[PDB]
Amino acid sequence: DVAPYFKTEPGLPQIHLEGNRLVLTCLAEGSWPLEFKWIRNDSELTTYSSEYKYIIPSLQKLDAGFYRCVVRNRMGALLQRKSEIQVAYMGNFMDTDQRKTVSQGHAALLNLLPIVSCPQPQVTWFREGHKIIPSSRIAITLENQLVILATTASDAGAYYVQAVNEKNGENKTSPFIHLSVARDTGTHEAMAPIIVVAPGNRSVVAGSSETTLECIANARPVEELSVHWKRNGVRLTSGLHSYGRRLTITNPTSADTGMYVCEATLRGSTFEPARARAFLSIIEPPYFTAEPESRILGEVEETMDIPCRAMGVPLPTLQWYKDAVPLSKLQNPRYKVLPSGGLHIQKLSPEDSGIFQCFASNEGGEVQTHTYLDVT
């Protein structure tokens, strides 16, 4: 009379190479007979058997997904926490050149040519065999876009990238972006600061090691451009990188949350500074504030309340299962999920015996609790 339980749990996401072997194991204990089956995303890959492992001899791209095992015995069935399986690959660039024109003095934003890859590739920008290096007038964004500030006639040319997949070592060369610069054939005058890449908003899971905001401005003469960051009106003097364009917040906590301001100034000018706001927030993963007892006894025809309550930021959503089947699919009229969390069962039936499982989740993660209900 021991309900199934897991001896071990799956851990962090894993990236695997195409062509490699994947082994998943479902290690559980409990009364005889323990049987197992496997799920990927929301499809069952196998039917119940005594086999406790799932093996893919040679991984392909669309083996990537979320894998769960289910363990059952005569008492009920229990759904395991998900394993996230990612498969490394690198596609090809389209073999067609692009064209782009920019008016002199304005920033040229050159996007990374489209390529599908897991993980995202490391990128190097080139023109005519020479690497394009970040500088006071050249920025490469966190999403590997090339930004040329205060463009001059000399910036015209054929730009391309070499992309490398860090996990499988593959490298690809893109076609060209042919950048034309339309010259200003008048006297060059100062150009006011303008934000060309704004930092936007950022949400991080509590405990994160670092997060980085990015703000890129144009002005002319670009040598007189300054980009600074402010927090509560005061200029920040830590976490600064890339000519003021990046602000790294290390081990962000609740003290760090709220608004940050990027401010771009043209020195020697009386232009108003350009400003952009960024908001940092923290996701707090779910935790239970109420779990049911591990075992509950009910009498037939009576009612049953199975508690489940969880906290987190944002407030976690709860999902119930009975014997590894979601209540949303069972559509049992007698099972009432209470908005605040618990499950209320009207008129207990012998069929209600089994394992009830409550999952709590938000963007920061998922936790689970369960009970074995014995109806007599």
Distance (Å, whole) CA 48 – CA 262: 57
Burial bucket for residue 146 (CB in 10 Å: 0-12, 13-18, 19+): buried
Q: Are residues 137 and 216 in the same domain?
A: no
Which structural technique was applied?
X-ray
Find out whether 91 and 115 touch, Cβ atoms under 8 Å.
yes
**74 backbone φψ class: left, alpha, beta (φ>0; ψ -120 to 50):** alpha
DSSP track, 265-290: EETTS-PPPEEEEEEEEEEEEEEEEE
Q: Are residues 119 and 154 in the same domain?
A: yes
Strand partners, 251: none
Distance (Å, whole) CA 33 – CA 50: 8
Q: Residue 221: is the preceding peptide bond cis (ω within 30°)?
A: yes
Side chain identity at residue 197, one-letter code: V
Q: Residue 314: is the preceding peptide bond cis (ω within 30°)?
A: yes
Q: Which two tokens stand for residue 61?
A: 């791209």
Phi, psi at 62, each rounded to 5°: -95, 25
Computed on alpha carbons and rounded to an integer, the radius of gyration of the chain in Å comes to 28
Quick count: other Cβ atoms within 10 Å of Cβ 1?
10
DSSP 137: S
Distance (Å, whole) CA 33 – CA 51: 12
Q: Are residues 158 and 216 in the same domain?
A: no
Q: Side-chain half-sphere of 307: how many Cα atoms within 13 Å?
A: 10
Q: Which two tokens stand for residue 266?
A: 């043209």
Q: Are residues 175 and 195 in the same domain?
A: no
- Burial letters for 189-200: b for 16+ Cβ neighbours within 10 Å, e otherwise? eebebebbbbbe
Q: Side-chain half-sphere of 209: how many Cα atoms within 13 Å?
A: 0
Range of the domain at 247: 191-284
Q: Can you tell me whether residue 350 is helix, strand or coil?
A: helix
Query: Using CA of residue 347, residue 349, residue 351, residue 357, what is the dihedral sign?
Result: positive
Spatial CA neighbour of 313 closest among 279, 285, 341, 281: 285
Cα end-to-end span (Å), the chain: 15
Q: Are residues 94 and 170 in the same domain?
A: yes
Q: Are residues 198 and 278 in the same domain?
A: yes
Quick count: other Cβ atoms within 10 Å of Cβ 66?
13
Q: Are residues 232 and 175 in the same domain?
A: no
Helix (H) or strand (E) holding 263: strand 258-266
Q: Which two tokens stand for residue 265?
A: 């100034």
Burial bucket for residue 223 (CB in 10 Å: 0-12, 13-18, 19+): exposed
Spatial CA neighbour of 292 closest among 305, 283, 274: 305
Resolution of the structure, angstroms: 1.5
Q: Are residues 172 and 240 in the same domain?
A: no
Find out whether 134 and 153 touch, Cβ atoms under 8 Å.
no
Find out whether 285 and 311 touch, Cβ atoms under 8 Å.
no
Residues in the chain: 376
Q: Are residues 241 and 275 in the same domain?
A: yes
Quick count: other Cβ atoms within 10 Å of Cβ 30?
20
Find out whether 50 and 346 touch, Cβ atoms under 8 Å.
no
Q: Are residues 231 and 263 in the same domain?
A: yes
The residue whose two tokens read 């100034």 is 265
Q: Are residues 255 and 229 in the same domain?
A: yes
The secondary structure of 197-251, three-state, reads ECCCCEEEECCCCEEEEECEEEEECHHHEEEEEEECCEECCCCEECCCCEEEEEC
Q: What is the maximal distance between C-alpha atoms in the chain?
A: 93
* Residue 21 CB partners (closer than 8 Å, separation 6+): 55, 56, 57, 58, 59
Distance (Å, whole) CA 256 – CA 279: 10
